[model samples]
Target: VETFAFQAEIAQLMSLIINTFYSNKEIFLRELISNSSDALDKIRYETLTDPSKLDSGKELHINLIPNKQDRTLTIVDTGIGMTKADLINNLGTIAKSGTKAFMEALQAGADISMIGQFGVGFYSAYLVAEKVTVITKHNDDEQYAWESSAGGSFTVRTDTGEPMGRGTKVILHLKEDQTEYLEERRIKEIVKKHSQFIGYPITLFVE
Candidate 1:
């Protein structure tokens, strides 16, 4: 395991972005799926030069499962999965985030202001989940899992469940306060709004 620190300013910056910039909590799902689609695009682009390096098939898609009985929601994507280092750097620090760029673009009058810019897409799970678990399998690495409550730190380890073919699955244990996100209509609306332009199929599973 490795450890790193976030610059003081970066922490404050993330707090500001999470607390203020995101007006609607539902945007988190959209941002995550958009990021997934981008990851798939990156893999697809890379495969053009080295077809043998393709680990996952080209059936890029996003799936959302909502469980009203358990007050849980799961978002799954067939896209790029992160390594251990990626979990630490990507989730623990915000120094290289596109959020800063998005904020700058907003200030400079850019036409689009996407939250995916900041790499905060993963944390968006915390908006509705009291606890979040990420089960991921990368093309180059074995399956792994990350779990957190968004309090301060998170835990990561090898996954013990059935192996995933490729990509990531995020399971959110919904908080009582945000059960609205579990509604099929609400989830679909949010997906349609911010992620309709994304290049993959997005499906919602209701139960």
Candidate 2:
């Protein structure tokens, strides 16, 4: 296992970003779903260029698993996952060092637009949850988990659990006040609100 601190810019602005989006916490789900869709898109594009990249028989889709008992809402996507360096670069450094311009745009009261302008979508997870765990498996890399509380540092380690086949699984450990997200109806509503048009088929498992 290896530990790394978030970029200095990200560390400094973490609270501000969280405060800015606290009222809009539900956007976290949208941001996450959008991320899953994009990951699926990457793998789809890769497979077109090289069919061998489709290394698993798992169908490309998104799974939303709401665990009320654990107070965790998990989003699993059979999409292109991440390698160690990719995890550090993307999660730790704010998507290839776009912190300067992105943070500026964020402070400028441009919220939603920042999603298209930069990959700030991922950090939106902090709006509703205190911790986020990302377990991903890339075709070119071993399965690894990237975990962070957005406090300053994150840890990356090889996954010893069953292989993911292909794709990423993001588990959000919801905060006490954010337990509403654990309700199946709430997640379904969020999916209907923002992810209705996503290309990949999304399945929300019901207990």
Candidate 3:
């Protein structure tokens, strides 16, 4: 089993991003969906080298489901899921230097304007959720589940149910004041504004 660790400085960086960077809490959905699209793109590119790697037969898409009664919003995708180590590194860390390196490369000379940066984006969910749960199944490893409240730490464990074909599902336990995000119209508007140009299909469901 592999593991990843977050540096001490990331905590402060996370606090800054969560408290100051995002003005509108609803943008959390857009950030999560955008991250999903990036995952799908990664799997798609990998498929060119190893066609069998594309195990999921479904089209690349994003699904948003909101439960008004529970005040929860679930965003799911059939893209590249995270392994245990990935959960630790991806969700546990704050500012991933690799993402910073990518941005720096672009600023230096690289013309990769289309690349999406998510190191800071993941924390954006905390702007709305009091708690967050991530359930994922990767084609290369056993399924894993992660949960946290954007506190100093999070919990990680092996999943005990049917595997999700291959993708990531981010469930946001929204705060009482943020119930407006549960509305289909509002969710769709956020998607259209920040992610319409994104290369994958996005769907919204409310109930």
Best candidate, lDDT: 2
By TM-score, the best candidate is: 2
Q: Give the per-residue lDDT digits (tens) of candidate 1, residues 1-207.
A: 222444444444445544554446776787667767766776677778988546566677888999989888888887777777666665433545555665686677642335456565665665567788888887777888887664345678888897878778888898898888889889888877877787778888868
lDDT winner between 1 and 2, please give it.
Answer: 2
Q: List the candidate 3 regions with Cα displacement exceeding 4 Å.
A: 1-6, 18-22, 92-118
Go through the candidates in order and give the clash count of each. 3, 0, 0
Q: Output the lDDT of residue 123, model 3.
A: 66
Q: TM-score for all predictions?
A: 0.79, 0.92, 0.81
Each model's Cα RMSD: 3.6, 2.0, 4.9
Candidate 3 per-residue C-alpha lDDT over 32-85 given as tens digits, one digit per residue, 9 for 90 to 100: 887888789878888889888775645678888999988999998888788887
lDDT of each: 0.70, 0.82, 0.73
Instruction: Tell me the deviation in Å of residue 30 in model 2.
Output: 0.9
Look at candidate 2 and tell me the lDDT of residue 165: 86
lDDT of 2 by residue, 1-207 (tens): 898987777775566666664476788888888889888988899889898888673489999998988889999999988888889886423553565677677668866435535766787787777889999899888999999888789999999987888899999998899998988888999999988999989999987
User: What residue runs in model 2 are displaced by over 4 Å at the alpha carbon?
Assistant: 92-96, 112-116
Q: Clashes in candidate 2: how many?
A: 0
